[PDB]
Every structure is written in C-alpha cells, then in structure tokens.
Amino acid sequence: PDINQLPPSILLKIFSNLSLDERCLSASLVCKYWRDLCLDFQFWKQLDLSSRQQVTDELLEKIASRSQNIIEINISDCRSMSDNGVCVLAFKCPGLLRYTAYRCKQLSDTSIIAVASHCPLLQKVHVGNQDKLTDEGLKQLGSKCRELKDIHFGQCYKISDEGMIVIAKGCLKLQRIYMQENKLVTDQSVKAFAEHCPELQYVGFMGCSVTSKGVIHLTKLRNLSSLDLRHITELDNETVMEIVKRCKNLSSLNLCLNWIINDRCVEVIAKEGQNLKELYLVSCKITDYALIAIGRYSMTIETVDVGWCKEITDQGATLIAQSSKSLRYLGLMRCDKVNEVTVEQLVQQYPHITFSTVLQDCKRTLERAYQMGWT
Amino acid sequence: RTFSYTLEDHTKQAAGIMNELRLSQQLCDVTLQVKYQDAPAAQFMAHKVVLASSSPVFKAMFTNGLREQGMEVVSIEGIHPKVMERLIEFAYTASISMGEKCVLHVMNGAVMYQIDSVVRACADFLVQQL
Amino acid sequence: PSIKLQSSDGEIFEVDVEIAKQSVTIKTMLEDLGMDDEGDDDPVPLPNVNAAILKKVIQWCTHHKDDPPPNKEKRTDDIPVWDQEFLKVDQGTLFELILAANYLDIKGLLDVTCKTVANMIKGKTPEEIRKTFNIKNDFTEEEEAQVRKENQWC
C-alpha cells in the first residue's frame, strides 16, 4: 500500500475534503510531496476561514491576488479584516457562488455593495448579524445577483422593507430565505416574496413584525417545505390551517412562542398535513388533545415538540406514543405536569422513540461525559 | 448591599454535575456571543439542555430543526454580559446573586427569557428598595 | 441490454448496459464503438482493472443504479452506510478502487473513496499519518520547522 502512487489529481481531491486546520497543521507536515500538493492554490476552491482566531486581514488580499478559482467563501466570526479586504477579494473572485460571514459586526454595506458589483453568480448569501447593513446596500444585491438561491439575514436590525421588496423583485430562483428578530420587516416583505418567487422552499420570519395578513400570502407557494414562524405577532389558527391545507409539500412547521395556537388547530394541521414531518409547538397554549390528534390522525409526523406547554400530562404522551406510527422524537421538555417515572417506563417499553425531557437529555449528556468520566 | 435567590427542585443532582461539566469546558453545543453597547463581545459556552430547561425562549431558539454540526453560535444583544452570566449561573445552579443596583438589569433579562422564579424575586427586591 | 467486459487478468463479466453507463469511460467507448449493430457482442477490454476490483465496482454500481445526479457543493460526512460497509477493505483494495473510479470515471465512487481516505487522514498528527500510510519523513528538522513557521495563523 502506497498513497503516493495515486495521481496528484486524486491526492488534491482527497486533500480538498480536509479542513484548513487539518491540512496546514498536519497534511503539510507529512512529507515534502504532500507539502507541495497542499501548498498549491489551484484546487483550493471552497475556503473556510471561520474564526481562525481572527488572524487575517492583509492575508485576505494576498490570497485574493493569489487565485481567482474560488466558488465559496466562509468568513464567519474573524472580526480582524475590514471592508477593503472583502472588496478586493470580490474584485478578484467573480465566479463566487456561496458567501458566508456570520457575526461580522464590523462589516458595513460597502462590502456587500462591492460583492454584488463583482460576483453576480451568487447562489448562497448568509450574512447573519453584521450591523450597519442598510437597504441601499441591499438593493445592490437585489438588482445584481439575480441568480441567488439561499439568503440569510439573521438579527440584522438595520433592514426595513425596501431592501426586502427589492430582493423579492429580482432573484426569482430564491429557494431559501431566513430572517430572525428583524423588526421593520412586516407583511409587505412577506407578500412581495411569496408572489414573486414561486421557487421558495425554506422560509422563516422569526420575531419579525409579521401578522397573519402576511403569513396567509404564503399559500401561493405550493413548493414550501419548511416554515419558521416563532415568536411572531398574532398568528390565528385559521391562517396556519390554510397554510397546511394549500402548501401540501410542507414538511417542517415551526410555531413556537405563539400563545394563540390551540389544539383544534393542531388537529386540523395533522389531518390536512399529508407531508408534515416535523412540528414544533413550544410554549403553545395547548393540551393533551393536540398530541392525541397528532397520534390518531397524522401518519407522517416524526418530530413533535411541545416544550414548556403547561397543560401536557402523562396521558397526552402515552396516547401519542401508542397511536403514532411515524413518531420517533417526542419533545416533552419542561412539561412539569408530566411524571418522570412515566417517561422512564415509556423509554423502557417504547423503542425507536427518543423521549426528551430535562432529566432524560441531562442523562444522555452525562453518559456521553461518563464515557470520559470524572468527579 | 447585595440580594440573592436560591431554588430547590428535582434537578438537585443533574444541575450540579452539569455545572461541573460546564466548568470543565467539555461537552458543549451552544455558544452565546453577548454584546451590549460598548461592552466586549463576551463568549460563553453552555449546553442546550440546561438553557432550555430554565427558559422557554432558549428552547424555542434551540428548535431550529437541524442540529447536525453540533456546536451552534447564538449572538445575543440588548443585555449586558454580566447579566447573561448571572442568568446562566442561575440556570445551572438554581441560585443567583446580584448587587442592589443591578436588580433591574437582571429582571429585564429574566423577563426577556421568561424565567418566572427570578422575575418574582427581582420584583420583590425592587419593592423592598423603597 | 447486456455488455460483456474483460479484465486485465483474463476474466469476463457480463452486466447490464444501463449499469455500465454509470462509468463515463465505459459508456463513452460503448457509444463510439458499438453504436451500430453489435458484432456478435464482442468483449470490451479493461486493461487497467483486474478481476476482484472490477467485481467490487460492479457491486457498487449495482447498488447505486437509482441515484439521481443533480458538482460543486459543500463538503460533509454523509457517506451512506452501504458505501461504508462496502469500503471496509484493506488499504490495497481501497487504493485500487480509487484508481478504478478515476479510470472508469465514476464520480460517486471517487467521491466516497476520497472522503474515506480524508477521514482516515482527519484527526491525526503527521507522525501518525506517516505510520498509517507508510510514508518516510523526508523533512529535516529545519524544513519541518519552516513549514510550520509559514502556517502559524491557524
């Protein structure tokens, strides 16, 4: 057996599957042949510069001037470099497909302007947090990167509806969109997104200033697979009923922190949800009737979570463990009216179901820790 | 002066060993980057289970539907890192302590994360400061 | 549909044409060679793959005959279970499978085997990698210091 007998193309392809740490701190120190192979810039392509103890700035411009053969750039964390490095990297990499840079709260909108201006083939853009992200820097991406597919703007409080509607007008291929705690973004953005981009599959407006009037417009998206509506302003039961009725491709529905979803709504969703696979109802003011309906009527739900639901009892879990054939994960987190000995009996006499309470998850973590025990 | 509040429940054994595990910096899957005005981007590491067992908002934020990569980074704003640290200490040890001038910030954080026990405690403390 | 291939050591394997179409090289030489009427189903010679490796590749392509191919996506640790169970072989067989997947142009098998080798590399110091792969350390203590000097930013 000899690895070096393989052609250099195969070895480069193998090294491409190694992280930057594992390649620079181990692979480059095996022998001079692997050193010369990993030193090559040709087959770098996707580069992950996440965190990196924030150790780069001028090196960003160095590697930008080095190679143009970059399709995905990950700049998560690492607050060291400024907008100039991002600008020159966008100048040097037009063939960029995926852009990722979470929690870079020092990057302004000049970076995203240069990005939109110097790489239109973008498909995935994840810019979580990062304050000073105005809509005027966002309409650049909305009008220039029409080939966009995935977009993430998590906790970017400096975004209103203008940039969102501009993004919705263009980028007809947008299959994913996620926004969290983004105020100033209301029903208008949701409506303009739902009626302009039928390619939408993943959508989420957690904590945004969205009401049922904007949520009901998602029925025009028969390709919706996952919907995230956690801690959202006043979502009546009828709206999500119509959502589950029309969007037949709905797989994951997230309704956490909605104090008005009742058990009749869960029953309607379980009945008319022929493709529903994951349902999250944390803090939803329901009762055991919701779980009983999920068990008796839905033959497709695998993951159901009723965490912090006050009125859930032992029977509500026992009946759904008996009557649900597709159930494999039960979210019984902080249901204080549930006895723990009952949950122990359930986990002992019900296989393929991972009952998740406080003590059960703590016990799983404690076993994973006792594998390397201490005291 | 200084106020404090201690609670005893069913997790008297699990919470302590989970706190020791947290102090060991071992098994962790949640990273909180707290930022507040001009305070540094404080970085805490913790388990999803302990944070979800004491606050429904943390549980809702941890049910994102896909946790393949294990470690998740959750940036938190509007709260001072010391307040968040005291909240995590209560979540892990069922006991919290604060200065007589930091009761309001602790109560704000607890109301933001719906921790009823320390909310009532801080309410009683703010009433007793009159 | 039926195609009869011959290995480099002299064994003949008759398989489905749609299964052999997973190999871009095989299907390309088939379209160029036997597009018109077949000459009594002449054997197709593969001089760079022996018998056992060809049999393993045929098994892998038979299990993976319904996979839908959509080229440049993110890297993960998917590697389906059956692929792992099939790749539970020695190093020689794995390297020969790599050589065949590069020769027969089987992108799925190439990806899975390269990911297996990269997982074998992952989480190991150079001293451990050299022992697990039989590679002599041609680095002097000077160059071994210079290389890690130039990569201090990790």
Swiss-Prot record, chain A:
Outcome reported for the amino acid change (mutating residue 309 to R): Impaired ability to bind substrate proteins
Protein name per its UniProtKB record: F-box/LRR-repeat protein 17
Covalent S-S links between cysteines: none
Occurrences of domain F-box (ranges): 1-47
Subcellular location: Cytoplasm; Nucleus
UniProt organism field: Homo sapiens (Human)
Gene Ontology annotations for the cellular component aspect, listed alphabetically: cytoplasm; nucleoplasm; nucleus; SCF ubiquitin ligase complex
Role summary: Substrate-recognition component of the SCF(FBXL17) E3 ubiquitin ligase complex, a key component of a quality control pathway required to ensure functional dimerization of BTB domain-containing proteins (dimerization quality control, DQC). FBXL17 specifically recognizes and binds a conserved degron of non-consecutive residues present at the interface of BTB dimers of aberrant composition: aberrant BTB dimer are then ubiquitinated by the SCF(FBXL17) complex and degraded by the proteasome.
Full-sequence portion shown in this chain: 319 to 693 of 701
Assembly mode: Part of the SCF (SKP1-CUL1-F-box) E3 ubiquitin-protein ligase complex SCF(FBXL17) composed of CUL1, SKP1, RBX1 and FBXL17. Interacts with BTB domain-containing proteins such as KLHL12, BCL6 and BACH1; specifically recognizes and binds a conserved degron of non-consecutive residues present at the interface of BTB dimers of aberrant composition. Interacts with SUFU. Interacts with PRMT1.
Curated annotation (Swiss-Prot), chain B:
Places the protein is found: Cytoplasm; Nucleus
Signal peptide positions on this chain: none
Cystines in this chain: none
Summary of the tissues where the protein is detected: Broadly expressed, with highest levels in skeletal muscle.
Site keyed Sensor for electrophilic agents: positions: 102
PTM-bearing positions, type S-(2-succinyl)cysteine: 102
S-nitrosocysteine modified-residue sites: 102
Residue positions where S-(2,3-dicarboxypropyl)cysteine is found in the record: 102
Domain notes: KEAP1 contains reactive cysteine residues that act as sensors for endogenously produced and exogenously encountered small molecules, which react with sulfhydryl groups and modify the cysteine sensors, leading to impair ability of the BCR(KEAP1) complex to ubiquitinate target proteins. The Kelch repeats mediate interaction with NFE2L2/NRF2, BPTF and PGAM5.
Known partners and oligomeric status: Component of the BCR(KEAP1) E3 ubiquitin ligase complex, at least composed of 2 molecules of CUL3, 2 molecules of KEAP1, and RBX1. Interacts with NFE2L2/NRF2; the interaction is direct. Forms a ternary complex with NFE2L2/NRF2 and PGAM5. Interacts with (phosphorylated) SQSTM1/p62; the interaction is direct and inactivates the BCR(KEAP1) complex by sequestering it in inclusion bodies, promoting its degradation. Interacts with NFE2L1. Interacts with BPTF and PTMA. Interacts with MAP1LC3B. Interacts indirectly with ENC1. Interacts with SESN1 and SESN2. Interacts with HSP90AA1 and HSP90AB1.
Family the UniProt entry places it in: Belongs to the KEAP1 family.
Stated name of the protein: Kelch-like ECH-associated protein 1
Organism field: Homo sapiens
Full-sequence portion shown in this chain: 50 to 179 of 624
Curated annotation (Swiss-Prot), chain C:
Summary of subunit composition and partner proteins: Interacts with KDM2B, forming heterodimers. The KDM2B-SKP1 heterodimeric complex interacts with the PCGF1-BCORL heterodimeric complex to form a homotetrameric polycomb repression complex 1 (PRC1.1). Component of multiple SCF (SKP1-CUL1-F-box) E3 ubiquitin-protein ligase complexes formed of CUL1, SKP1, RBX1 and a variable F-box domain-containing protein as substrate-specific subunit. Component of the SCF(FBXW11) complex containing FBXW11. Component of the SCF(SKP2) complex containing SKP2, in which it interacts directly with SKP1, SKP2 and RBX1. (Microbial infection) Interacts with vaccinia virus protein C9L.
Keywords on record: Host-virus interaction, Isopeptide bond, Phosphoprotein, Ubl conjugation, Ubl conjugation pathway
Post-translational modification (record): Undergoes autophagy-mediated degradation in the liver in a time-dependent manner.
Record Pfam families: Skp1, Skp1_POZ
Pathway the protein contributes to: Protein modification; protein ubiquitination
Homology family: Belongs to the SKP1 family.
Its job: Essential component of the SCF (SKP1-CUL1-F-box protein) ubiquitin ligase complex, which mediates the ubiquitination of proteins involved in cell cycle progression, signal transduction and transcription. In the SCF complex, serves as an adapter that links the F-box protein to CUL1. The functional specificity of the SCF complex depends on the F-box protein as substrate recognition component. SCF(BTRC) and SCF(FBXW11) direct ubiquitination of CTNNB1 and participate in Wnt signaling. SCF(FBXW11) directs ubiquitination of phosphorylated NFKBIA.
GO molecular function (one): cullin family protein binding
InterPro entries noted in UniProt: SKP1, SKP1-like, SKP1-like_dim_sf, SKP1/BTB/POZ_sf, Skp1_comp_dimer, Skp1_comp_POZ
Region (Disordered): 62-77
Organism of provenance: Homo sapiens
One BP annotation, GO: protein polyubiquitination
Phosphothreonine found at: 125
Region span, Interaction with the F-box domain of F-box proteins: 98-154
Protein name: S-phase kinase-associated protein 1
Cross-link (Glycyl lysine isopeptide (Lys-Gly) (interchain with G-Cter in SUMO1)): 136
